[PDB]
Amino acid sequence: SGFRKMAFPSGKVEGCMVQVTCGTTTLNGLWLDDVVYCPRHVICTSEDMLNPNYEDLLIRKSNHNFLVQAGNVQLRVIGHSMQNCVLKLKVDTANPKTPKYKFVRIQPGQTFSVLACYNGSPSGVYQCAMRPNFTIKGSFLNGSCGSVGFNIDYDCVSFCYMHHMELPTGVHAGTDLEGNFYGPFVDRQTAQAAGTDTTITVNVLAWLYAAVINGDRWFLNRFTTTLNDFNLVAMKYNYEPLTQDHVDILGPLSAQTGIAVLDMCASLKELLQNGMNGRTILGSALLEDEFTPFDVVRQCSGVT
Amino acid sequence: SGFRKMAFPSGKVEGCMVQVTCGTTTLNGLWLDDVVYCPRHVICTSEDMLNPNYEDLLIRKSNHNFLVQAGNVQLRVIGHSMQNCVLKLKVDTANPKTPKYKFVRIQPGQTFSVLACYNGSPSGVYQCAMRPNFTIKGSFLNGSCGSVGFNIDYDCVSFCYMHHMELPTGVHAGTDLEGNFYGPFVDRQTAQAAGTDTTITVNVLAWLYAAVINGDRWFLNRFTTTLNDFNLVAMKYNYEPLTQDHVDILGPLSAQTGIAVLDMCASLKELLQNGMNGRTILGSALLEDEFTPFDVVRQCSGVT
Numbered sequence: 212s213g214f215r216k217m218a219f220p221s222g223k224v225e226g227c228m229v230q231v232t233c234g235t236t237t238l239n240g241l242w243l244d245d246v247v248y249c250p251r252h253v254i255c256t257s258e259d260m261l262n263p264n265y266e267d268l269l270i271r272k273s274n275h276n277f278l279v280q281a282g283n284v285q286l287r288v289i290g291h292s293m294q295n296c297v298l299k300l301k302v303d304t305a306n307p308k309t310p311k312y313k314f315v316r317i318q319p320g321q322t323f324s325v326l327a328c329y330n331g332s333p334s335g336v337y338q339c340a341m342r343p344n345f346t347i348k349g350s351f352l353n354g355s356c357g358s359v360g361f362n363i364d365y366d367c368v369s370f371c372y373m374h375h376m377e378l379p380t381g382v383h384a385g386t387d388l389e390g391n392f393y394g395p396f397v398d399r400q401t402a403q404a405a406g407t408d409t410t411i412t413v414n415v416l417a418w419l420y421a422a423v424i425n426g427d428r429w430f431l432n433r434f435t436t437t438l439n440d441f442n443l444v445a446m447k448y449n450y451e452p453l454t455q456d457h458v459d460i461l462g463p464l465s466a467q468t469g470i471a472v473l474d475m476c477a478s479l480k481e482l483l484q485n486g487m488n489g490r491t492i493l494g495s496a497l498l499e500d501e502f503t504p505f506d507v508v509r510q511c512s513g514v515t
Numbered sequence: 516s517g518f519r520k521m522a523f524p525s526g527k528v529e530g531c532m533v534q535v536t537c538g539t540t541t542l543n544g545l546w547l548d549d550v551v552y553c554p555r556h557v558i559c560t561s562e563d564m565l566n567p568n569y570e571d572l573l574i575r576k577s578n579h580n581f582l583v584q585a586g587n588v589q590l591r592v593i594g595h596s597m598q599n600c601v602l603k604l605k606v607d608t609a610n611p612k613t614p615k616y617k618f619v620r621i622q623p624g625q626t627f628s629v630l631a632c633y634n635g636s637p638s639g640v641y642q643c644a645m646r647p648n649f650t651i652k653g654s655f656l657n658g659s660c661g662s663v664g665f666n667i668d669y670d671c672v673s674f675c676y677m678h679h680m681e682l683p684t685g686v687h688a689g690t691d692l693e694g695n696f697y698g699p700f701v702d703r704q705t706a707q708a709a710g711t712d713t714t715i716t717v718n719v720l721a722w723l724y725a726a727v728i729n730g731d732r733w734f735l736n737r738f739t740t741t742l743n744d745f746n747l748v749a750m751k752y753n754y755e756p757l758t759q760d761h762v763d764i765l766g767p768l769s770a771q772t773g774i775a776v777l778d779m780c781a782s783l784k785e786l787l788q789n790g791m792n793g794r795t796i797l798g799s800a801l802l803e804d805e806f807t808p809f810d811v812v813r814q815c816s817g818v819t
């Protein structure tokens with residue numbers, strides 16, 4: 212029992228982290244097989260970030276300008292290419308620590324672990340959700356660029372995020388491993404609107420099922436609701452509309468606890484309309500939305 | 516910017532996890548050098564846990580009864596000994612993945628990362644605080660015993676906790692790596708009182724300094740207090756009394772933000788007496804006490 216914001220074990224990812232330096236800028240790279248992936252903004256100077264012409268800037272760079280170091284080992288760069296907002300540095304050595312991996316583009320509302328790195332060294336791991344507005348509420352300082360997000364299924368690492376920047380609002384933006392930004396963000400030092408965010412409704416319900424499984428039951432009530440009625444409430448409180456697809460994915464947690472999805476929606480409706488009244492749920496005083504139905508089952512069943 | 520309940524990268528610890536089986540019971544072991552450490556309750560059956568006579572039970576066991584497997588590799592056990600509540604299985608092979616390590620007994624209020632494991636396989640990592648009452652509010656299921664807590668300073672892993680049991684109250688108890696339980700707990704299936712817990716005051720103040728560094732400033736006020744006045748309030752709200760040692764350790768965060776420790780105590784006093792008024796601090800709706808002053812500086816400075 213107990214419920215924590217648990218991250219995947221970062222071991223398989225630590226073995227891929229490298230440091231990439233170009234000119235005077237240093238950031239993190241991801242070494243998989245004979246390729247090192249890093250944000251293309253490694254080629255910019257402080258002056259360049261106002262409106263960088265990445266194609267022009269990369270043309271001044273040669274393989275020998277990209278310095279790649281894995282711990283105390285220097286990698287020989289035999290090729291470079293830009294794909295969207297990432298650079299792919301071909302190296303002459305396959306990473307001996309390359310785990311089985313995939314590159315995936317996660318959907319908003321999904322979760323993943325971030326291994327925050329500086330100078331190619333891992334400093335910490337934490338679990339995040341990709342916000343509905345395609346930002347992540349990370350924890351990243353100068354030099355954290357190139358740090359990646361991921362999920363692990365048995366022995367396979369699905370890399371889903373690479374960190375590129377922090378917005379003035381203190382939230383984070385980045386790309387999938389093909390260099391495509393999540394959201395409307397551009398790798399330019401300009402004011403960038405992150406859309407209106409919403410609370411991930413299916414994850415809050417999943418977290419309420421985790422609370423029930425763990426014994427925190429006070430929020431359960433004698434009421435039920437309908438998808439239509441519940442979504443009128445969700446709209447008012449800036450929660451994502453609940454769909455039948457969300458109800459279906461909540462099926463296993465519904466079966467585990469014997470609490471029908473719409474009945475759990477009625478507890479959520481009452482918590483939105485009345486607040487927590489100074490009580491807590493799983494040690495939290497607000498409604499948590501960073502656990503998916505899959506994370507809840509995994510944490511409550513023990514998948515390794 | 517941003518602030519997360521960040522765990523250490525678990526890589527160095529994943530490389531030490533093994534599975535230990537004795538009879539029909541399986542749990543996790545920690546393989547460091549040529550020794551495997553695991554909870555001594557691995558030798559008990561379901562019937563034995565009422566009041567186990569561990570010395571008598573271990574006498575029926577031979578080296579060949581302890582089955583130790585590291586992934587797909589079987590370790591040969593050449594020796595066994597009980598030290599307090601842990602068993603130490605001497606194996607004929609030094610773990611090639613043994614990092615530089617130490618065994619430390621942490622103090623209450625200190626934090627550490629837990630790598631939750633099942634069948635010798637790591638499932639997740641999360642950051643914990645050792646409660647003032649010597650419990651940990653973990654997330655652990657059947658088979659999680661032998662999972663360890665730790666801190667990492669550059670290349671050195673300081674192992675501080677090994678998981679042994681879950682109390683009826685759903686909180687967790689365990690030992691240091693010499694098998695000494697933290698708190699009054701015994702490895703017996705009996706009702707066990709965990710003392711009155713308290714909020715770790717120095718950690719809440721440290722977390723308030725992290726909030727200020729990150730821009731969450733609304734709780735700052737025009738007031739100051741004294742250690743005596745502040746502790747009258749701390750007593751009323753079951754917070755640990757603040758000492759000059761705590762003030763001293765908060766020195767760096769005081770210097771960073773230019774907010775004197777006693778002035779930050781006055782903000783904490785007002786938050787305890789008036790609540791949060793439906794506002795949040797670092798995404799939390801309650802006062803967080805699982806970040807030490809050291810964790811705050813590390814997360815806000817970027818130590819790898």
Ligand SMILES: O=C(NCCNc1ccccc1)c1cc(=O)[nH]c2ccccc12
Nearest residue numbers: 351352353354355376377398399400516
């Ligand atoms: O290193 C960072 N940025 C460099 C790329 N800077 C850029 C990239 C794209 C567009 C505009 C500017 C950085 C990352 C972060 O998440 N938090 C920070 C906190 C303080 C100082 C810097 C950081």
Ligand SMILES: O=C(NCCNc1ccccc1)c1cc(=O)[nH]c2ccccc12
Nearest residue numbers: 212655656657658659680681702703704
């Ligand atoms: O495996 C666990 N215990 C076995 C040792 N059981 C024992 C050990 C010492 C004293 C009395 C009994 C266990 C650990 C945990 O933290 N959460 C659980 C949740 C459900 C089922 C079991 C667990």
